[PDB]
Amino acid sequence: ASRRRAMKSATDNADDLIKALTLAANRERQAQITQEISEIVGGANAL
Amino acid sequence: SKQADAYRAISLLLRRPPGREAFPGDVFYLHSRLLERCAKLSDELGGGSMTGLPIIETKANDISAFIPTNVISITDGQCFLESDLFNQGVRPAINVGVSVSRVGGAAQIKAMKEVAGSLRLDLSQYRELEAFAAFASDLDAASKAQLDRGARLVELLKQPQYSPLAVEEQVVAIFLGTQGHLD
Amino acid sequence: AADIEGAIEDYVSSFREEIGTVIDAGDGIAHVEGLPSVMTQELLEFPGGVLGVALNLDEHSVGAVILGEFEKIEEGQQVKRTGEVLSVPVGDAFLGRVVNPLGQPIDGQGDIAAETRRALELQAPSVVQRQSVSEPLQTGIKAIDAMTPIGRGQRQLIIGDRKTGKTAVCVDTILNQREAWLTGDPKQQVRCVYVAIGQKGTTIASVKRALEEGGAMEYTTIVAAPASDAAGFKWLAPYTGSAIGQHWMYNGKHVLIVFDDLSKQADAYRAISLLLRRPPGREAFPGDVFYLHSRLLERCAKLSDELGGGSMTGLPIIETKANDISAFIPTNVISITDGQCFLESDLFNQGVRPAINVGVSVSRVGGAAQIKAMKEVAGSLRLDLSQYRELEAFAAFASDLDAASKAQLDRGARLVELLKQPQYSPLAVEEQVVAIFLGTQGHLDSVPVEDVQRFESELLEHVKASHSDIFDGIRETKKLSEEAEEKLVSVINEFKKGFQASDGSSVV
Amino acid sequence: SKQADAYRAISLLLRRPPGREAFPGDVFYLHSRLLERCAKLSDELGGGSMTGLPIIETKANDISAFIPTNVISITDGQCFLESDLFNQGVRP
Amino acid sequence: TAGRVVRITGPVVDVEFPRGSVPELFNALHAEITFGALAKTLTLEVAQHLGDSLVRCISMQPTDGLVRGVEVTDTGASISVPVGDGVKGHVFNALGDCLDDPGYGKDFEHWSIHRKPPAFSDLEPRTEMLETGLKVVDLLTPYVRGGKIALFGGAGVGKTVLIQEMINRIARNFGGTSVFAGVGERTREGNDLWVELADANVLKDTALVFGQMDEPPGTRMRVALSALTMAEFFRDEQGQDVLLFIDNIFRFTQAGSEVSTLLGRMPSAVGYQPTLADEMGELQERITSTRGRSITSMQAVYVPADDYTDPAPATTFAHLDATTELSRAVFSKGIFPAVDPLASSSTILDPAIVGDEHYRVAQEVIRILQRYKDLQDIIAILGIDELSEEDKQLVNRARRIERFLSQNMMAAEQFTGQPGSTVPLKETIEAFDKLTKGEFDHLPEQAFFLIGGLDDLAKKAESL
Amino acid sequence: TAGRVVRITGPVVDVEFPRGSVPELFNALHAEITFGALAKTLTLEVAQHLGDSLVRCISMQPTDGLVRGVEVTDTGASISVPVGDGVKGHVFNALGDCLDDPGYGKDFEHWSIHRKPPAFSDLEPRTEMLETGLKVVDLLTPYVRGGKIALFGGAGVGKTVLIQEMINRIARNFGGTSVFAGVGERTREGNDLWVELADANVLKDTALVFGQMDEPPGTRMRVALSALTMAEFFRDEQGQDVLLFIDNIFRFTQAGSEVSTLLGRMPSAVGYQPTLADEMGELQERITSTRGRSITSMQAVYVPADDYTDPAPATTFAHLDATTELSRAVFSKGIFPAVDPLASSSTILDPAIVGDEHYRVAQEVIRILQRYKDLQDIIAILGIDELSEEDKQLVNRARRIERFLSQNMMAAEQFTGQPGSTVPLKETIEAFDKLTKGEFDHLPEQAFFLIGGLDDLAKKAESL
Amino acid sequence: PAIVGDEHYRVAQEVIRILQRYKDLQDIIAILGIDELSEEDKQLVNRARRIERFLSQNMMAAEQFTGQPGSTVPLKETIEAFDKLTKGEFDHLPEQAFFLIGGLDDLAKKAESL
């Protein structure tokens, strides 16, 4: 009964970790794309 | 946030090179120049005042994002409305701890300051106690009383849309909950 | 004032063959001054016997990309326009050949007897010219035909990492059409074009050898733009394959096109665009890189009976990097195509070859691309694999798990073994209907998981050699009829008593 | 890493197009031409030597970064000083 | 008098004009292509004035075969689409040419696609609920009369059947009309839709507008404003309630970014156009009610990477008022129309807009279906007997509730032959209020599949 | 008649010529530097024609001391390098001048650096297995005799130690000719190769060309083509089987990226040149072996920031038959040679060519190591004793297989102190067939680490 | 240690080691909570949480927000308190005793108030 309760807790903590990491991987994806564009259009403006 | 996205549009049409999150370098000198207009003037200047309530749409509660942190660094506090509390039906969804006012408490009227003077802490400690005790079998009677008080303070603080309470009624409504008449 | 306007108008209106001259050359581009009447996409010719596409026209110069031997170009070379937009020869003479993206033979055999010529850029068939995709392009892959079926007229993306079996799934698809080609009926007889873009030459020679070893060079064309050839050839290869295919499609033949890879089509068009100083967008691709792939792929269609009822089936391949299906070119081709056979490198290493990640892979055509016998047999297969894909977390607790779902876990494990298949061994539909039947009807349930692939192979060899009437029935009537089902169950239980497992146990 | 940042400033004021990470294209040929010019000479050249200890600051402790992985490939070895080891008593 | 082409760079074309005759921006211009294999009346839309009488245009058709110095005529108005009742029962490209019979509709009134949204003073100050008559929709995700509905469909999940259903609802219950904006439609499924709506006989009350993927991003961008201009005529001039489908609104955002990059503008954020929120505003703000008549919209929306924070979905979800979601995990149960009761949501499901009784009932139905969704793990792994008497008393209700969200609907009348049912809002609430309190626990689950309200539940149950 | 320098900007030099005297693309131009210790003849390659009789050139040697308006004479032909039997046992730079004995090559036949790759008619796929005696290579990534082999890896993951071991294994017994290209490799390891080949007496059959990273982008580009056009002489004109080692082939495309901005090309994704796949393809296709005449290429490919999504690695992966693939993850565990068993791949690894006994074992090892990498996330947090008895047994096999793929290489004498070992292929298959069926689970986990086959595994286990 | 002295340096490295080990356990703590650790790690984490909280203080500037007064702690009393915490003299006090408190005598007063 404690293994049930504690493994329900560990599942809800692993889901709140998947959420927080998915939000971080999205912010990093968007920053990587934004940065890559900023470098490309900077090299187009320099020419 | 939509003024920021509109000054980004103008700046990129003028080909001014972008910075972080593609916003132009002066997207801070947009909002800061705007919000510094809001002041309490001295009695030399008429004693008038202007109170700015800027809104910002975050994305998935990224309160650490570029425009959120620009406006958090300008303003004197935030009322962070959490969407997880809003979906649980706690409306307005004020997320204590991360919500704060840093100029407030000087201006809050004496009666409200006497009734609410512990309430912020009594709610933050209720949220941590409940986050713990939701996955526990049992707890001591004092902690169980503080959990029930906290849940009745949250039910005390929510209110329906377009029902603004006069301060003379707010102080009484918070008296009900803080003095334990709701127990 | 007004006289300058009249005189400039008369100068511009003042504009044998027209001559230009090269003014700049570099990196595969040559800017040509003159050619006042040049049209966009016109084949220019340069005096060394070199070609260019006139892909950009400016106020005073023509930005022509160069299709080969670019080192032979110089400033001041006299450029002649040919009177024609990009066009390629077509016909049945291309079957069995390897050609460059101008339809010139590159296999070193005799010169191709061009039946007709088509422009590379003729319009795709409009919504009034098409028909619903109601008949199957059998791939002969159990993990495709039973779960993401391809109908002739569909566009199915074989997206995945490097070295995951994308080329192998398409070569199994091209080899599988032989059993239809041998019947001389143009309504069964699928033709194939394999467009190799930016392959190394030895890889295209390996694919030619893998097709010859299975007789597929009777009806397959290769369009080869090996990485040696200029960015302009790597950019045109898919349109040269699509024009050779479209000639057979409009004649009422059935075609399969494999584009291997559309990722290197896009990376060649990016090179040409960035050299032409065109404005770059996301991931440095030009603004029209979606329009490049959509105008390529949407030419794959099934035509109406009024246009002879031919069809062209596109199997584009793309190489994702670190499984990032959310990159630009993956996201484009995932939105243009009708289905996506996501190959994955972990499933490939776990032994799951052909490595198709079922339950994210999808076909939007659905059951319309399957024969009735395949629908009745395989409809439950996706449900059994989605239940097994939930239950695999309980593989450590198979004794504690409830018996009703324990019988789903062991079933799923025997269906996952059933969907494994060696390369260059495509199954005819008559044989994979029976293979999926062994699984979904539960005849495998008593076979040990490690012996399932040998049980399937030995059962299909037995049924093919001794009970050909089960396969003949399924083929000629497209339905697993009740009398053929009862005989199939009988012969499965005949065979299953003579089968011997890895542990040497009995069965049933 | 501060020479690479100074060469970026110099190149961007001279208006050369930035490459990746805003560095100039030849930020490798800044550090290779620097470091490859130190090695032990033959006895036909007096047998002298020069030994380079370049230092690099890895922003947020990623070894897999552009300038880090250039200098890791120019040099003959690494002494990657992890700040997490340094805190748990493992010093150097 | 007329202009001349002077530059061509893929879809982008620069046109020189005489000093006086420069067209205002967003005019349509016609240019000839005269090479026999590619003969076209190439349509150009004016994007910018480059100075020196030169106009930067974006081509609505492939520029293959354009010659420098070809004559360009100015039409003196924007891209204009045919409008009327006569556009119902037809399919048009983004330029307002019929695909099914070329030259049809050239006799009709033409409206310029670029027109402002309704003036601030004409907008309605409160959100009226759309009484569509679907049980699941009217209860769990009430639609907004003049609002936008996200529709997260998928392959085979009945999305085209829910489209045929909603077309039948608006045509028959409201006496309205539908328009279908095929933004970047795959030409295969655009033909499969045209033949499906013809075979259902609902095409007769629908005007389709397809901006096929074959086309340069000029028409994939403008097709949503073409279909919205047909809907704006049905709302303003005919006075009909309209239902504007858009499939797919992400491809309108994408095609706007591709045009922005073709025009050379610096990309914003993750590589969208800098104008993104302003041209999404130009499209979405224009879908609204005015003067007691409305354009409702259903917008199939893609979400790149599943990222609900990406600027394209984020700007899209800044507008739309409800989210309907279809799930294979529900369609495989036979629960048509397969609207997922828990992933779907609406901003109108609050006790200020819908009644307190509606809001209570919909919250109880969500609570029961959330409990059952949590219990389905135990049901699958351990079997039903592992649950308590109270947990099985909940699942017995939850099974019957999820079944009673299924409806025999006017799109299913094609195959079953039995008529599609409309369920009133009060009857929907009163039925789920009784059903959640358990007043039907003694009926089998089969009695609740595909049934048209409470009186019809009694009729099926007593005959089973 | 001769030209003159107009503009100088790093390694790129613009040169103006008389109207009729403009040189063809890729001609060598000579210009003189006349200051002090820098005084040299300078070689420029014509990269572009700018128009107005200007050509843009890349300098093969540093432009320091070059003066605007100095005379430039065109050689009339491309850069050319000595070819013939007599280049074996000498060291050359990219220009084909001998480093060891200046002027040595001047009486040889000179071949142009630039040529087309062989025609597609001349190519056939190679299927002979090369045996190296490295456990991980011969098991999981079997090399192709006459194929294009590679050693991918991040910065510092030991690629140059592995390539020097591959020279020492293959080129030591090999009966043909060998070439080594030094493309932007560290000069210290170029000298440690040069003295090691002299000591082992292999130098009598090996021609070395070095264009090390202290050299300007012009020579770091043209050195790979120079060494390759010595290998293409031994292939074509002599028909004697060749080995062609290339460390580091990435530096070719990197030096191309460094000039591309000065050449006025716009930068592509992550700042490469746009021509990347056309430069790299035009190099790599020449390295193929035509029918009847093998070149066994062995090229180490650097991977920027360890990111195997980086365009240069991602483009190089198409040109290769067996890709060994080093990683910092496996290196940081001390499992030198640091070969990643799951990323690394070969086209010859199929049961038609290597035989079923090899193929089954390679697939069982990959399946085990893949299940181990699926389990490392669980093992780091929940811990090994949580797992199933079958999974925990598989983990105790994978931890032994990981270490038994490591080997004491003969080039790693300095890294390990112990002498190197060669494990025959038959013994490699027998040892991994035992390991995958558990026949060594009773041995301590450390006993497999760095050990040369079963005889040494037994002697180490009994030493513990 | 040549500048702050041997004792202050020794104490500061013991505190940093404890907080480093705790931050390198945080990836397990976030999933499983404290109890699933080994005893030598769980002993460490209990004092790490006490140290992490005892680095807090009621500042003189904080009075305008909290209303409570500020506190000043001399260096000698700081070193002594963290020496006792890292040696483990205070593991019997609850974590809430250490929040926003200035020095050992005030830690004792707050522990009595609980």
Short mmCIF file of all heavy atoms in Angstrom, two decimals, chain C residues 169-209, unseen atoms left out:
data_model
loop_
_atom_site.label_atom_id
_atom_site.label_comp_id
_atom_site.label_asym_id
_atom_site.label_seq_id
_atom_site.Cartn_x
_atom_site.Cartn_y
_atom_site.Cartn_z
N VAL C 169 13.32 -0.38 -47.94
CA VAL C 169 11.85 -0.42 -48.06
C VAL C 169 11.39 -0.02 -49.46
O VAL C 169 10.47 -0.63 -50.00
N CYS C 170 12.04 0.96 -50.08
CA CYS C 170 11.67 1.36 -51.43
C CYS C 170 12.13 0.34 -52.47
O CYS C 170 11.35 -0.03 -53.33
N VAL C 171 13.34 -0.20 -52.37
CA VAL C 171 13.78 -1.32 -53.21
C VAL C 171 12.94 -2.58 -53.01
O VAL C 171 12.65 -3.26 -53.99
N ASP C 172 12.45 -2.90 -51.81
CA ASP C 172 11.45 -3.97 -51.66
C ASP C 172 10.14 -3.63 -52.37
O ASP C 172 9.57 -4.48 -53.05
N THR C 173 9.70 -2.37 -52.29
CA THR C 173 8.52 -1.89 -53.00
C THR C 173 8.68 -2.01 -54.50
O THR C 173 7.78 -2.49 -55.16
N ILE C 174 9.82 -1.64 -55.09
CA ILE C 174 10.06 -1.76 -56.53
C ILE C 174 10.20 -3.22 -56.97
O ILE C 174 9.61 -3.62 -57.97
N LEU C 175 10.90 -4.06 -56.22
CA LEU C 175 11.00 -5.50 -56.49
C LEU C 175 9.65 -6.20 -56.42
O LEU C 175 9.41 -7.12 -57.20
N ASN C 176 8.76 -5.80 -55.51
CA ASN C 176 7.48 -6.46 -55.33
C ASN C 176 6.56 -6.37 -56.55
O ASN C 176 5.66 -7.19 -56.70
N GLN C 177 6.77 -5.41 -57.44
CA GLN C 177 5.90 -5.23 -58.60
C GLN C 177 6.14 -6.26 -59.70
O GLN C 177 5.36 -6.32 -60.64
N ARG C 178 7.19 -7.09 -59.62
CA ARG C 178 7.48 -8.08 -60.65
C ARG C 178 6.34 -9.07 -60.84
O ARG C 178 5.94 -9.31 -61.96
N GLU C 179 5.78 -9.58 -59.76
CA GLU C 179 4.66 -10.52 -59.82
C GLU C 179 3.41 -9.93 -60.48
O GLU C 179 2.57 -10.69 -60.97
N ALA C 180 3.28 -8.60 -60.54
CA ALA C 180 2.26 -7.92 -61.33
C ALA C 180 2.72 -7.65 -62.77
O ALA C 180 1.92 -7.75 -63.69
N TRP C 181 3.99 -7.32 -62.99
CA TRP C 181 4.53 -7.07 -64.32
C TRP C 181 4.49 -8.30 -65.23
O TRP C 181 4.21 -8.18 -66.43
N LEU C 182 4.74 -9.49 -64.68
CA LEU C 182 4.70 -10.73 -65.45
C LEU C 182 3.32 -11.04 -66.04
O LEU C 182 3.25 -11.58 -67.15
N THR C 183 2.22 -10.70 -65.38
CA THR C 183 0.92 -10.67 -66.05
C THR C 183 0.86 -9.46 -66.97
O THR C 183 0.91 -8.34 -66.48
N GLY C 184 0.73 -9.67 -68.28
CA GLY C 184 0.71 -8.62 -69.30
C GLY C 184 -0.57 -7.78 -69.36
O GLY C 184 -1.05 -7.47 -70.45
N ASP C 185 -1.13 -7.42 -68.21
CA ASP C 185 -2.36 -6.65 -68.08
C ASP C 185 -2.01 -5.25 -67.57
O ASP C 185 -1.67 -5.11 -66.39
N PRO C 186 -2.09 -4.20 -68.40
CA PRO C 186 -1.68 -2.85 -68.03
C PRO C 186 -2.35 -2.27 -66.77
O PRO C 186 -1.81 -1.35 -66.18
N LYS C 187 -3.50 -2.81 -66.34
CA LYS C 187 -4.19 -2.43 -65.10
C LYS C 187 -3.58 -3.03 -63.82
O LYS C 187 -3.80 -2.51 -62.73
N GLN C 188 -2.81 -4.10 -63.93
CA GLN C 188 -2.04 -4.67 -62.81
C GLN C 188 -0.60 -4.16 -62.84
O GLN C 188 -0.03 -3.82 -61.81
N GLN C 189 -0.04 -4.10 -64.04
CA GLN C 189 1.35 -3.85 -64.39
C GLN C 189 1.86 -2.47 -63.96
O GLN C 189 1.90 -1.54 -64.76
N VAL C 190 2.25 -2.33 -62.70
CA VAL C 190 2.95 -1.14 -62.20
C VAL C 190 4.35 -1.02 -62.79
O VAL C 190 5.08 -2.00 -62.85
N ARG C 191 4.73 0.19 -63.21
CA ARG C 191 6.09 0.62 -63.61
C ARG C 191 6.75 1.39 -62.49
O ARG C 191 6.06 1.90 -61.62
N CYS C 192 8.07 1.51 -62.47
CA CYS C 192 8.76 2.19 -61.38
C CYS C 192 9.80 3.17 -61.88
O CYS C 192 10.49 2.91 -62.85
N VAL C 193 9.97 4.30 -61.21
CA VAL C 193 11.08 5.22 -61.40
C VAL C 193 11.76 5.39 -60.04
O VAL C 193 11.11 5.75 -59.08
N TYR C 194 13.04 5.10 -59.94
CA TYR C 194 13.81 5.38 -58.74
C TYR C 194 14.68 6.60 -59.02
O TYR C 194 15.57 6.55 -59.85
N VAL C 195 14.39 7.72 -58.39
CA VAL C 195 15.13 8.96 -58.53
C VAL C 195 16.13 9.05 -57.39
O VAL C 195 15.77 9.28 -56.24
N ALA C 196 17.40 8.85 -57.70
CA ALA C 196 18.50 8.96 -56.77
C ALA C 196 19.05 10.38 -56.79
O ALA C 196 19.63 10.79 -57.79
N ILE C 197 18.91 11.13 -55.70
CA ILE C 197 19.39 12.51 -55.62
C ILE C 197 20.53 12.60 -54.63
O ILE C 197 20.36 12.37 -53.44
N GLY C 198 21.71 12.98 -55.09
CA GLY C 198 22.87 13.13 -54.21
C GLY C 198 23.31 11.83 -53.53
O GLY C 198 23.93 11.88 -52.47
N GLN C 199 22.98 10.67 -54.09
CA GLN C 199 23.64 9.41 -53.76
C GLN C 199 25.09 9.45 -54.24
O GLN C 199 25.41 10.16 -55.18
N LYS C 200 25.98 8.65 -53.66
CA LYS C 200 27.26 8.38 -54.33
C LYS C 200 27.06 7.37 -55.46
O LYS C 200 26.17 6.52 -55.37
N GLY C 201 27.89 7.40 -56.49
CA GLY C 201 27.69 6.56 -57.67
C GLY C 201 27.64 5.07 -57.34
O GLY C 201 26.76 4.36 -57.81
N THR C 202 28.50 4.61 -56.45
CA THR C 202 28.50 3.21 -56.03
C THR C 202 27.20 2.80 -55.34
O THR C 202 26.76 1.66 -55.48
N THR C 203 26.52 3.70 -54.63
CA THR C 203 25.23 3.37 -54.02
C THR C 203 24.15 3.15 -55.08
O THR C 203 23.36 2.22 -54.98
N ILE C 204 24.16 3.95 -56.15
CA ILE C 204 23.20 3.76 -57.25
C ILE C 204 23.53 2.47 -58.01
O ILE C 204 22.63 1.75 -58.43
N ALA C 205 24.81 2.11 -58.12
CA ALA C 205 25.23 0.85 -58.70
C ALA C 205 24.82 -0.35 -57.83
O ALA C 205 24.38 -1.37 -58.36
N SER C 206 24.87 -0.23 -56.50
CA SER C 206 24.35 -1.23 -55.57
C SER C 206 22.84 -1.40 -55.70
O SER C 206 22.34 -2.52 -55.74
N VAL C 207 22.09 -0.31 -55.83
CA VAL C 207 20.65 -0.39 -56.03
C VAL C 207 20.32 -0.98 -57.40
O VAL C 207 19.48 -1.87 -57.47
N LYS C 208 21.01 -0.60 -58.48
CA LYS C 208 20.85 -1.24 -59.79
C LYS C 208 21.11 -2.73 -59.71
O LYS C 208 20.28 -3.50 -60.17
N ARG C 209 22.18 -3.17 -59.05
CA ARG C 209 22.47 -4.59 -58.84
C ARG C 209 21.41 -5.29 -57.99
O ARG C 209 21.02 -6.40 -58.33
#
